[model samples]
Target chain A: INIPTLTLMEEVLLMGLRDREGYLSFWNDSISYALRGCIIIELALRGKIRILDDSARKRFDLSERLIEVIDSSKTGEVLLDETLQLMKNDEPLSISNWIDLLSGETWNLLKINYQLKQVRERLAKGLVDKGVLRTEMKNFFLFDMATHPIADASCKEAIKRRVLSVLVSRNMELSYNEYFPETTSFKIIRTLALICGSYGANVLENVLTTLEYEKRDKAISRAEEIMAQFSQYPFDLEKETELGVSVNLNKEVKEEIENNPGHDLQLEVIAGVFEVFSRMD
Target chain B: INIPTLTLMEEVLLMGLRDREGYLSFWNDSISYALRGCIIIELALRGKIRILDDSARKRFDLSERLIEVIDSSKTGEVLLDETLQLMKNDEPLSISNWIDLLSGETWNLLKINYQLKQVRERLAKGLVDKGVLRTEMKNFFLFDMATHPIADASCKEAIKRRVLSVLVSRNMELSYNEYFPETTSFKIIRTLALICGSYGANVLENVLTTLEYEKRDKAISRAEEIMAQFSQYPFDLEKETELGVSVNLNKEVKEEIENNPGHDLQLEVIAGVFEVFSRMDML
Candidate 1:
């Protein structure tokens, strides 16, 4: 099974010659670094380079750097395993495992850093015209998120309103967060949001208690306001928009409310006498 | 063939009876509250218990008291749903499509809240010789999650994780989440946790980048170091711990990383971290 071939040094040199760029220059860069470190080791072993030449020895010492690179590689491996722990998502391992070295923390930063210096270079290469995600120039907006002590009742109300608003804005879609890792993505956001809202209700059953009343009415209304808004086209706007999502959104709350009850809307409502946080009074 | 069955009113009366005592009490407490407000609408349209008695009509006229009772039901539902969601984590789903009736935002919340409570309850029950998860308790946890969040990430994760964690804890075989009406359950938790982990990493990174560098690094390093420590465990325990998983992981990532160098460290690292969170923090 043994076939005679190039030695280690010759093998490396041969790899150098196969480089795409002007082979000689690549070979020069590749080997100089390799040889610079190896020769010192070789010379020291051969009893030529003296230990007293500490400065010269330091220049060739690649051991720590090499070890770090290797350690990082192993760490990278661990990251992949954890990221894809439950890779049952319908997507491919490659596409779905978003937190890997691929789209994760490090490589992303590297691209951004590399791109910053090469902006003009990128433009010259026709990258700017590639038409990626559109960037809006300007707009005034206020993001109102008040998680002021998640325990407080008022804080809970704010959170409920915020989640509703987020949904209204369509802020929680596939496009919102690049791609997803699927790691704990399902649990952290959806499960947490659900539980958080429920807990908010339990500690202070003000909002949800109120909502049940409205939900009953919504169900009764059988409102087509939203249904008609977009039913015309199925919104042939984008590729992603084509994905038919049958959202089973019932405006009603209970089965009983449907068969027996007529709609109930009483005057036991609101008295918000202009309560605004630093608004025009 | 026809069969004798209890009428709806009879069922409700029995339900009311069962609420006072027996296995269905807590669930009754939760459902009845939803019924109270709903029943008001019913009364307005249908006949009432005592229409002749004008006194009861005024009292039951969808007034503040009835609203208050219904509101209390909403609160109980929160506790009840949380417990039910925990059970959902431990079963299998037979379908995929979610029902409209179950998609209430409150449903997801209540289910998760119940699940949180149920976990502590299960642990407490076992510790106090309550003899682990009773069938009634288990069923409540299971069916309750039917009204849960699906499109959202964490709702699914909780359902999946709740299922997986319970299965593991009980040494039971894996099961599926109910599909008919997107219930939060063990099956949902495991599947969604996995899906979102894959999907949400793409999600979480953007969120993480918004955080300060120090926070991000600390989180990254925290997961990284813990992962490295866990890696040492297989070696320490002389187990066939797949050390070269990073190498094993790359065929998974797509065109985004033409060359998946160092494999999937963040993910693998995160799993170990989550194992800690689930076993320790979540417990």
Candidate 2:
């Protein structure tokens, strides 16, 4: 049996949105940025873009290395194709710049070829077409908004299996060998885990909290690692503690750490030692 | 059945050295740095350390957050306890700084409490005590270095099962519900997977190559994400390309991508747009 595939954005939306909520978790910010990163990642995955050889270049060099796009043919996917076309202009850029531009970071700095719009809605439509989602009108305060809800049982189940598959670990109730066959379940799982873990794990209270024991440990660590990769990206957090999170954490934990009398001890030492470049060249 | 537990350094040494070979993977670099990071992670896992919060802090900030040592008691393990004592000094460095210090980054600036001396030998000794490894001398060109080879079958098999269990989605040859009945195998898997993936997937070639179909994809993507988390860390890439890693991959395809002249068409536009900030920002 052929399992249906999901675009990066579609997978993110599926994991971030509650089945019936039809909206993103409030804690996540700049869907626009995530959408852009996904585009580059997806392009790379499709054999379109490849990073140049490893050199002594810093993050910028790493980010701006020879971003070669092997094929110029339309990617068939509109949003992706649009970004690919944007990159084909006379002046090519480092990967970092393209991501920032598409993420709307460069809005005040310079004008780019295009802006990513209706991303969630368009991606939701794509999901609907794949028989995984259905749209319904819902009253948001005064105005009505179209909300996409999960449509197929097996589809959502397949998606969840993948999310939890990577979120926690092998401790997941279902055996990967038994429940997850050779289908593309894992491909789908990593995308979702990457997106959710990138945004923030706490916001997904229902998912994170519901996980127990070894599963919770796996999820938190995996989430932390996923959160670590794009740790350079920006996001916010404001939610109740996950049910079983070992550490009773919240904003207070950050505050407590910063305010402690000992907080500056290490920072001062490091600054004093590395102060050669700390002040002037 | 109960599985054996390992110190952070022991785990790091296990991942770095190849069994039977009893030496660091010819590809991996600075085993000292990896050992340091694992120590921090292990301390955190033991409640001896904790991140401040899940704030708007970046990964560097989060990973290096004001790491608080909730419990300062000796962790009972030598390497772990040594790290803890290093932290007891009034100087409260960020977890990142500690990792860097342990890794020898701050050597030029100031003296830290101590350097991780004979880390591999010490960790190998730990594994030996657990009966998981046995010491053997191996010749590397001019000199012989002490190496620890897997001493027990059940031990390495157990470790292998855990590593593949996470690397691949399924087909680990065992059911999660059936075999993985919560023996801290998941912990071992993530720790091994984290270190291996951080270095490169090739070191674990025997494991990755042995994995079949559905299993390979799961391992690769998961490994990539793990690698992604530490994107700031260093590793090597002589093993083909990380991109375009869809089941079909080899040298010709990578060459095919590099040689294609159209490759620069889109690249130049991206370069022109972001040229201004490239020199200023290191990140």
lDDT of 2 by residue, B70-97 (tens): 6788866788888788776644555545
lDDT of 1 by residue, B41-85 (tens): 222111111112123223211121111111111212233333223
- lDDT, candidate 2, A197-281, per-residue tens: 2343233333443322345455656555434332221112243334333232324324433454332222221112111111111
Summarize candidate 1's per-residue lDDT along A6-99 as a digit string, tens digits.
1112222222221111121222222222322221222222222122212332343212111000011111122222222322222222211121
CA-based DockQ, model 2: 0.01
Give DockQ for candidates 1 onward, in order: 0.01, 0.01
- After superposition, which runs of candidate 1 have C-alpha atoms over 4 Å from their true positions? A1-151, A156-160, A163-281, B1-283
Task: Give the range of the ten consecutive residues with the poorest summed lDDT in model 1 chain B.
Answer: B92-101
